Design a binder for this molecule. Structure first.
Ligand code: CLA
Ligand code: CLA
Ligand code: CLA
Ligand code: CLA
Ligand code: CLA
Ligand code: CLA
Ligand code: CLA
Ligand code: CLA
Ligand SMILES: CCCCCCCCCCCCCCCC(=O)OC[C@H](COP(=O)(O)OC[C@@H](O)CO)OC(=O)CCCCCCCCCCCCCCC
Ligand SMILES: CC1=C(C/C=C(\C)CCC[C@H](C)CCC[C@H](C)CCCC(C)C)C(=O)c2ccccc2C1=O
Ligand code: SF4
Ligand code: SF4
Lengths: 100, 97, 741, 143, 41, 80, 159
């Protein structure tokens, strides 16, 4: 067969030959509480598809970034929202010619 | 390697005498008074450093504490003793000489 | 008996017959040239002795005599430096005033206006201010006269002629057999007892009898003309017993083991001499006595002809683990069979040693008035750092050459080398990941600081003020070595260096050495150092482990060590060879050590070097390294643009040649890019369109003009790149530090 | 001569394990198997890395690339003077014989193998690329 | 010494000799006629 | 797959086949330029494009000619 | 000189993984097998929820203690939690497009488990399985970021 006498190639066992192994994967079904599994299977039902999750991402992200520009960058008190709060570098156009 | 077809689970040959004897062979000699310590010992000063640093428990030791020196030397010798003890035990048990 | 002299009488006849026939050493080039590539191959294969023949005996003889020639050349160079310090120097003037007079030992002839290079160095002299530190070395030897330099030069020329006679002898007249070279036990026993043990013992004797009294009197203000000559300190014991009363006891305290009586000239002072700014010569004398004893007992370790001792084969063969298979078996055969395996290890450790030297010569300046010659100190760090990096790259090279040529898989079955080649993918993958991790977390820190300070957010930088990454481990080690004489080295009067902390030693107003603080900038640059080192290691080690085979090319060993590519196939296989990995490791060695020496220069000019005139240490750049070197714009502005003011304004002054070699080095570096960016096939067609014009005018040569090889193009490019970059840095460094330091 | 069937009962050389072996290409696309009958136990050089000990008699060895198999083929043919023959194995179990596709090695004639991809003109008698323009795909004048 | 003089006839030795001679000639010209910018004499 | 074409200047020296690391080329008898052998490229699906073959061809320029074409796993030397 | 530790993977010296203590020590293999990534029998949505909770709770810390608003007292945790929410959303989009890209071929080769018993293929490595895995990842990541904010709000020794 495969595992004995150093016969490392068998046509009837191509998984052991090629190396298609699960080094750490176990197939046990008893992990999570069924109340918790029900909760988190139901909480993801509306997004368990590709296009629907991409729709949620698009909606939530467009909304988050738009409201970031509208209120969030102000609530974060970003300097770009406050403005210069001074005259600025207006009159110092150059060391020689102090342009506006 | 015609042998070793399963990666044995006892890859380290554990004899519980080894850690005990390494702790004993390093720490008991680590409690011998030398005049460089002022009549005290490395391990005694180490336990004293841990006692002083346990007083202000949340904050950690300083940089000029002299606790780190004792810790690092004690653990250097300790890890070397335990390592060589495991090596010697599994060299006497196995071949290698 | 086993270990003995074994030579052949008159193996090779001494004649110029093979001088008239170039390419004689190979079977391919001895037929003569037809293309110009022959002219390059004649030089590339000149010292490739292991391809001229297969027998290790003839290769070994060639190597031995070649080493003799290198030694003779080194002796010529040493004698030349001593001679230039004897005839063309201000040494006797510098000894009287070493804090004011600039060390110079190269006079320029006044031919085309280069008499401007004969600068006003001091002592009524006009020449080029040297930075090799020979004056400090000679003062530390106790020279005090140009005649002694003259006779040392003549002795060096005698010894050079002796070395060349020795090479001729040991090749042509009496050349040793292979079983003589293969006595590595004897070679190590002798190179440890007699070469490094007896050499250090003899140098200790000189340091006891010549350097210590002469320098003790030099430090006591005595004029070098009225100091007793060394032979007078040998014969007249009264002078020495006046200087050190333990010389009144003779050599009895040694044979009675009352060694503490010798505590006048064998000390453990530590720190620096306050009057010279260098290490105590009594400390160095005791040092060399000690390591001489140590090496002389280390040279009695291996077994040669009397059963006592060790067999290196037995140490190696009995060192094996459960993780490592058979262990070091077959390595004795590897290293007693391959010259390249030896050369790899030797170059690696020799270059790491040269960098050890660079780091240990500035923190512990061994020579009087070395630390206060900031040019000599900077040059001596930079030079040995560069030599070390080059040697390390060559170590990777010759490891690869071993793996290609001298590797035999029959000798190496499940030994350590086989087990490395078997999991080279793990090795190189983890090395790649750490190189990426370090590149990010070491350079993106600099980019983060650039972005923050450019955006006007200095509170978000990685600095000693905003987000501190303090190097707490190195700081703890500094404090552990500063407090060492109090607890962990009670017989030391001071620490080894003042860089650990404490008081500064300032000599002549200039700071010889002072504590070195480390902060966030030092953290970042040290991690940059480790990053670049790890990438160079990645390249060279990947060239070593994949020198025989890879998942791309499984037959790379048959292709060779030095080949350009297998083809454009497999998507493209250029620079798959183990030679091209060295070619790239050269670039990364340059990139690493440029930053190393930049870190050195800036840290020294900002936080160590300076003057104390009033109450206060005024450094050269004012300590900007702490706050300015968080950014790449910092190294631009305050190092590469600020410290370039001395090299680009050097025109019309004594340092103008430094500016010239600045510009010319910028030329050569960029010229390298003609060879690195391009490829042979363009130049061959350009060359043949030129050969058409030569044929038309009947001036086409018989030796057909070819473009350089691909490998040769890469070699020329890396050579010009390294030369130009290193010489640009050399000019910049020296022009800066001769002026401001 | 007839096409040999791959024997899976053939043992493998004594190898202690490497990291240069098979990847997911073996499980997904293809891999290769080289066989040879040895007269003795000789430590040869694996193209993946490291040295293995061939067994006295028949050997068998897996590789993820045909170039690996032919590298070992030339190594066993030139340094050991053997006559190996390798295949191409697909993950579904299909075996395809590859190297001595007619029985004899390709540098030797076999008196009956057909000449393929032979242009019966000189290399300078190829047409200009303007004549093979707009032939569908981008096509060399050698066609 | 026919072979020795053949060696001195090689390309690099002849180039060294010839360029040493040329450079020395130009150097001695520039010593005895310092700073020759134009053809005035 | 790359395109390997072999022209009638082949003198049949077998060097292109001995150099080929992928067993793409073979020597066919007399059904080519002349008698006394000839080369051929029947297994170009395995050609990577290394041009060892035309590196070893001794004729004027190269009787064997590799024209780099579309790439694949077999034509990119991938073990993955 | 016996008792060699390093072995080839599953005894096969030609596959190239070299079973090693870091790879296949009992405790290490036990820990890696117990991770929700390698629970090939449980639904991928729940393993995604668990993985996402972990990753959304850990990656709030950096944005909190090192973000641009790290120094304003109360705005820091809010800002870092919103940043971690955005990053979790980005990662969920990444997972969705990865499920679109990868799972189209259904490779026919089987899977064993280093002991011979031919286990089934993980339903996670299917288009629907990865869709529900990314759904669980989004839900669990946003919940974990929210709870990281909560733990900054309620934990006693939160400095
Ligand atoms: C390619 C551009 C270029 C040009 C046009 C020049 C031109 C000149 N340079 Mg500049 N120079 C250049 C590049 C150039 N240089 C470079 C790249 C460098 C850096 C290395 C320099 C560095 C440099 C310096 C440092 C100096 C010059 C000098 C000179 C002058 C030399 C005049 C001389 O030697 O009289 C020679 C006059 C002759 C008549 C000799 C002609 C040659 C032969 C011998 C004539 C044949 C006669 C006879 C038949 C021979 C007998 C045969 C024999 C075998 C017996 C001249 C203005 C010098 C100067 O003062 O400049 C103003 C000077 O000091 N140059
Ligand atoms: C599980 C025990 C424990 C706990 C709760 C802490 C907790 C803390 N440590 Mg301590 N520390 C520990 C173990 C611990 N450390 C150990 C084992 C070492 C060694 C250190 C060394 C250490 C240093 C060197 C420092 C801290 C500091 C700190 C504080 C910031 C982090 C925090 C209160 C820092 C501080 O607040 O001071 C600090 O500078 N720790
Ligand atoms: C590393 C070896 C080395 C190097 C680089 C130099 C370099 C130099 N030497 Mg020194 N020299 C050396 C070894 C060396 N020397 C030794 C070993 C001796 C003893 C024989 C001398 C004796 C010596 C004298 C006596 C003089 C020099 C001079 C010079 C300068 C010009 C030489 C010249 O134009 O020759 C021309 C060479 C050919 C035409 C060929 C140059 C800086 C000269 C100098 O600096 O004058 C100020 C000078 O007068 N050298
Ligand atoms: C004058 C005396 C003499 C003579 C006639 C010979 C004759 C011979 N030797 Mg021997 N040899 C001699 C001295 C001599 N040797 C010495 C002193 C050494 C010790 C270094 C050797 C070491 C030696 C070895 C190891 C080998 C020979 C070989 C040979 C043969 C050819 C060498 C050749 O091609 O020379 C022409 C070569 C040169 C002129 C090169 C000289 C290189 C010198 C030493 C260093 C110069 C470096 C220079 C400073 C760099 C400047 C850089 C520049 C850019 C400015 C021939 C039988 C070879 C042999 O037998 O192979 C069959 C061989 O392998 N010789
Ligand atoms: C006490 C004995 C002794 C000493 C001092 C040395 C010293 C040396 N050996 Mg070693 N060697 C020895 C024993 C010794 N060897 C034995 C027993 C063997 C046989 C196994 C070898 C085999 C050996 C090889 C194979 C090679 C050396 C090399 C070297 C030189 C390395 C260059 C260096 O470090 O620069 C330091 C330079 C000096 C200290 C300069 C002074 C050199 C003095 C004059 C010679 C040393 C004494 C000499 C060995 C005894 C013979 C004297 C002579 C008059 C007969 C160095 C001079 C290498 C070398 O450079 O080749 C030339 C080299 O390739 N040796
Ligand atoms: C290799 C290292 C070295 C050397 C060469 C010397 C050499 C010397 N030391 Mg120093 N010394 C050294 C290391 C060295 N020392 C170290 C490391 C220490 C620290 C422990 C000292 C500490 C020290 C002290 C404290 C003193 C010396 C003294 C001396 C001198 C007396 C030698 C003596 O009595 O020994 C005896 C040696 C011999 C008997 C050997 C003599 C061999 C002769 C030359 C044989 C040759 C004859 C020949 C075969 C035939 C003749 C040829 C021809 C005329 C026909 C001598 C100059 C003393 C001195 O004079 O102070 C200045 C002294 O007081 N030394
Ligand atoms: C102890 C030191 C040492 C020794 C003995 C050797 C010995 C050898 N090396 Mg190794 N090597 C070393 C250090 C050393 N190397 C270092 C430091 C590096 C990194 C640069 C390398 C990198 C290296 C590579 C990459 C290769 C070798 C090769 C070789 C072999 C032939 C070298 C040859 O023929 O060149 C003859 C000499 C030359 C061609 C001259 C080189 C010209 C230099 C670059 C000019 C620039 C130098 C100059 C100082 C700058 C000023 C220029 C000025 C003139 C204008 C030989 C066994 C080759 C080999 O074995 O492959 C088969 C090979 O491919 N070496
Ligand atoms: C400035 C020029 C430059 C740069 C940036 C790099 C960068 C790199 N080289 Mg290359 N290299 C260069 C010049 C350069 N090289 C030259 C001139 C040579 C000589 C031939 C080489 C030769 C060479 C070799 C031989 C090797 C490398 C390797 C590496 C990598 C190691 C560092 C790393 O991964 O850190 C992480 C990346 C960086 C530090 C690059 C800067 C990125 C910063 C941090 C910002 C990131 C931006 C961020 C993602 C935002 C994106 C914005 C969005 C709009 C896209 C990296 C990709 C090694 C490698 O690939 O193995 C690890 C390797 O083996 N290089
Ligand atoms: C560095 C610490 C590595 C960990 C360590 O302590 O290694 C120590 C470990 C023990 O090796 P052995 O004692 O079996 O080797 C005996 C030697 O004499 C070589 O035969 O070395 C290895 O297994 C190979 C190298 C591991 C390299 C791992 C790098 C991560
Ligand atoms: C410029 C260049 C060339 C062309 C360089 C030519 C071929 C040679 C350069 C000069 C040679 C050395 C001629 C110099 C003169 C001769 C030494 C003969 C002396 C004659 C008198 C000048 C004394 C390449 O062949 C090449 C190949 C691969 C990668 C990059 C490049 C590349 O960048
Ligand atoms: S390119 Fe390489 S693989 Fe293709 S036919 Fe030519 S030699 Fe063979
Ligand atoms: S190498 Fe060239 S000439 Fe020789 S057989 Fe091949 S194609 Fe023909």
């Amino acid at each position: 067969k495969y595992g004995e006498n150093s016969r490392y190639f068998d046509l009837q066992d191509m998984e052991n030959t090629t190396g298609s192994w699960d080094m750490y994967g176990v197939d046990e079904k008893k992990r999570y509480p069924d109340n918790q599994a029900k909760f988190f299977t139901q909480a993801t039902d509306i997004i368990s598809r590709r296009e629907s999750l991409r729709a949620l991402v698009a909606l939530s992200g467009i909304a988050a970034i738009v409201t970031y520009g509208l209120k969030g960058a102000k609530d974060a008190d970003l300097p770009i929202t406050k403005g210069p709060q001074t005259t600025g570098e207006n009159g110092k156009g150059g060391s020689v010619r102090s342009r506006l | 390697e015609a042998s070793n077809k399963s990666f044995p689970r006892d890859w380290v040959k554990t004899d519980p005498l080894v850690p005990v004897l390494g702790f004993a062979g390093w720490t008991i000699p680590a409690n011998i008074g030398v005049s460089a310590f002022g009549g005290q010992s490395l391990f005694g000063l180490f336990t004293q450093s841990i006692g002083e640093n346990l007083a202000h428990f949340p904050t950690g030791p300083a940089l000029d504490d002299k606790f780190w020196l004792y810790l690092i030397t004690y653990h250097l010798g300790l890890f070397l003793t335990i390592t060589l003890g495991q090596i010697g035990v599994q060299g006497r048990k196995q071949g290698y000489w | 008996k086993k270990v003995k002299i074994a030579v052949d009488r008159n193996p090779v006849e001494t004649s110029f017959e093979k001088w008239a026939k170039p390419g004689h050493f190979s079977r391919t080039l001895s037929k003569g040239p037809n293309t110009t590539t022959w002219i390059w191959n004649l030089h590339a294969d000149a010292h490739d002795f292991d391809s001229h023949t297969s027998d290790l005996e003839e290769i070994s003889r060639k190597v031995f005599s070649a080493h003799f020639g290198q030694l003779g050349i080194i002796f010529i160079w040493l004698s030349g430096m001593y001679f230039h310090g004897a005839r063309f120097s201000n040494y006797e003037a510098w000894l009287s005033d070493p804090t004011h007079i600039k060390p110079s030992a190269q006079v320029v002839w006044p031919i085309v206006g280069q008499e401007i290079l004969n600068g006003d160095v001091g002592g009524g002299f006009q020449g080029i201010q040297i930075t090799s530190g020979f004056f400090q070395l000679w003062r530390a030897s106790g020279i005090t006269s140009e005649l002694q330099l003259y006779t040392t030069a003549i002795g060096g020329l005698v010894m050079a002629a002796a070395m060349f006679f020795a090479g001729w002898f040991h090749y042509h007249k009496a050349a040793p057999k292979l079983e003589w070279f293969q006595n590595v036990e004897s070679m190590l026993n002798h190179h440890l007892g007699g070469l490094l043990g007896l050499g250090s013992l003899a140098w200790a004797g000189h340091q006891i009898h010549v350097s210590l009294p002469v320098n003790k009197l030099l430090d006591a203000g005595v004029d070098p003309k009225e100091i007793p000559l060394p032979h007078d300190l040998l014969l007249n014991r009264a002078i020495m017993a006046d200087l050190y009363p333990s010389f009144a006891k003779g050599i009895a305290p040694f044979f009675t083991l009352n060694w503490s009586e010798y505590s006048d000239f064998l000390t453990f002072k530590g720190g620096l001499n306050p009057v010279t700014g260098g290490l105590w010569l009594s400390d160095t004398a005791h040092h060399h006595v000690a390591i001489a004893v140590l090496f002389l007992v280390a040279g009695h370790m291996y077994r040669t002809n009397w059963g006592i001792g060790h067999s290196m084969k037995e140490i190696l063969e009995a060192h094996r683990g459960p993780f490592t298979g058979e262990g070091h078996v077959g390595l004795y055969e590897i290293l007693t069979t391959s010259w390249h395996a030896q050369l790899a290890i030797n170059l690696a450790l020799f270059g790491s040693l040269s960098i050890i030297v660079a780091h240990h010569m500035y923190a512990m300046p061994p020579y009087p008035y070395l630390a206060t010659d900031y040019g000599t100190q900077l040059s001596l760090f930079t030079h040995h750092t560069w030599i070390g990096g080059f040697c390390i790259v060559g170590a990777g090279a010759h490891a690869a050459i071993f793996m290609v040529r001298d590797y035999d898989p029959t000798n190496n079955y499940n030994n350590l080398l086989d087990r490395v080649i078997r999991h080279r993918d793990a090795i190189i993958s983890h090395l790649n990941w750490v190189c990426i991790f370090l590149g990010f977390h070491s350079f993106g820190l600099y980019i983060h600081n650039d972005t923050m300070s450019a955006l006007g957010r200095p509170q978000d930088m990685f600095s000693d003020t905003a987000i501190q990454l303090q190097p707490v481990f190195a700081q703890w080690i500094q404090n552990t070595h500063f407090l060492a004489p109090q607890l962990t080295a009670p017989n030391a009067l001071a620490a080894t260096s003042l860089t650990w902390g404490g008081d500064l030693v300032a000599v002549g107003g200039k700071v010889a050495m002072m504590p070195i603080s480390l902060g966030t900038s030092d953290f970042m640059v040290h991690h940059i150092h480790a990053f670049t080192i790890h990438v160079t290691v990645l390249i060279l080690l990947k060239g070593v482990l994949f020198a025989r085979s890879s998942r791309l090319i499984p037959d790379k060993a048959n292709l060779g060590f030095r080949f350009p590519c297998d083809g454009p196939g497999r998507g493209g296989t250029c620079q798959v060879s183990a030679w091209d990995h060295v070619f790239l490791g050269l670039f990364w060695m340059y990139n690493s050590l440029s930053i190393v020496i930049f870190h050195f220069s800036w840290k020294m000019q900002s936080d160590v070097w300076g003057t104390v005139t009033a109450s206060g240490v005024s450094h050269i750049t004012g300590g900007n390294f702490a706050q300015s070197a968080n950014t790449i714009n910092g190294w631009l502005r305050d190092f590469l643009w600020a410290q370039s003011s001395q090299v680009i304004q050097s025109y019309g002054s004594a340092l103008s040649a430094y500016g010239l070699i600045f510009l010319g080095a910028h030329f050569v570096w960029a010229f390298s890019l003609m060879f690195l960016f391009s490829g042979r096939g363009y130049w061959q067609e350009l060359i043949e369109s030129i050969v058409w014009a030569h044929n038309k005018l009947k001036v086409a040569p018989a030796i057909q003009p070819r473009a350089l090889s691909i490998t040769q193009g890469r070699a020329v490019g890396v050579a010009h790149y390294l030369l130009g970059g290193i010489a640009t840095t050399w000019s910049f460094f020296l022009a800066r530090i001769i002026s401001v330091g | 001569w007839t096409v040999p069937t791959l024997n899976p009962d053939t043992p493998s050389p004594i190898f202690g394990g490497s990291t240069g072996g098979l990847l997911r290409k073996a499980q997904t696309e293809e891999f290769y198997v080289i066989t040879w009958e040895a007269k003795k136990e000789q430590i040869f050089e694996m193209p993946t890395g490291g040295a293995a000990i061939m067994r006295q008699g028949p050997n068998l060895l897996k590789f993820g690339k045909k170039e690996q198999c032919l590298a070992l083929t030339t190594q066993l043919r030139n340094k050991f003077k053997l006559t190996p023959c390798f295949y191409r194995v697909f993950p579904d179990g299909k075996v395809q014989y590859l190297h001595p596709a007619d029985g004899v090695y390709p540098e030797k004639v076999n008196a009956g193998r057909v000449g393929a991809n032979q242009n019966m003109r000189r290399i300078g008698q190829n047409v200009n690329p303007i004549k093979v323009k707009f032939s569908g795909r981008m096509m060399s004048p050698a066609e | 010494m026919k072979d020795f003089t053949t060696y001195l006839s090689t390309a690099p030795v002849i180039a060294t000799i010839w360029f040493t001679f040329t450079a020395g000639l130009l150097i001695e010209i520039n010593r005895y006629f310092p700073d020759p910018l134009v053809f005035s004499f | 797959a790359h395109i390997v074409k072999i022209y009638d200047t082949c003198i049949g020296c077998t060097q292109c086949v001995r150099a080929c690391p992928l067993d793409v080329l073979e020597m066919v008898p007399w059904d080519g330029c002349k008698a006394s052998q000839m080369a051929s490229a029947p297994r170009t699906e395995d050609c990577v494009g290394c041009k060892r073959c035309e590196t070893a061809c001794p004729t004027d320029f190269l009787s064997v000619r590799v024209y780099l074409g579309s790439e694949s796993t077999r034509s990119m030397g991938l073990s993955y | 000189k016996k008792a060699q530790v390093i072995s080839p993977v599953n005894g096969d010296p030609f596959v190239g993984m070299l079973e090693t203590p870091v790879t296949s020590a009992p405790i290490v293999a036990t820990y890696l097998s117990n991770l929700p990534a390698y629970r090939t029998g449980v639904a991928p949505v729940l393993r995604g929820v668990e993985i996402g909770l972990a990753h959304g709770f850990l990656l709030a810390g950096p944005f909190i203690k090192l973000g641009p608003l790290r120094n304003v007292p109360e705005t820091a945790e809010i800002a870092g939690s919103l940043s971690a929410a955005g990053l979790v959303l980005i990662l969920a989009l990444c997972l969705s497009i990865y499920g679109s890209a990868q799972f189209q071929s259904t490779p026919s080769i089987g899977v064993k488990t280093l002991s011979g018993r031919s286990v089934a293929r993980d339903p996670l490595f299917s288009a629907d399985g990865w869709s529900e895995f990314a759904a669980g990842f989004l839900v669990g990541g946003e919940a974990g970021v929210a709870w990281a904010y909560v733990c900054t709000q309620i934990l006693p020794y939160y400095s």
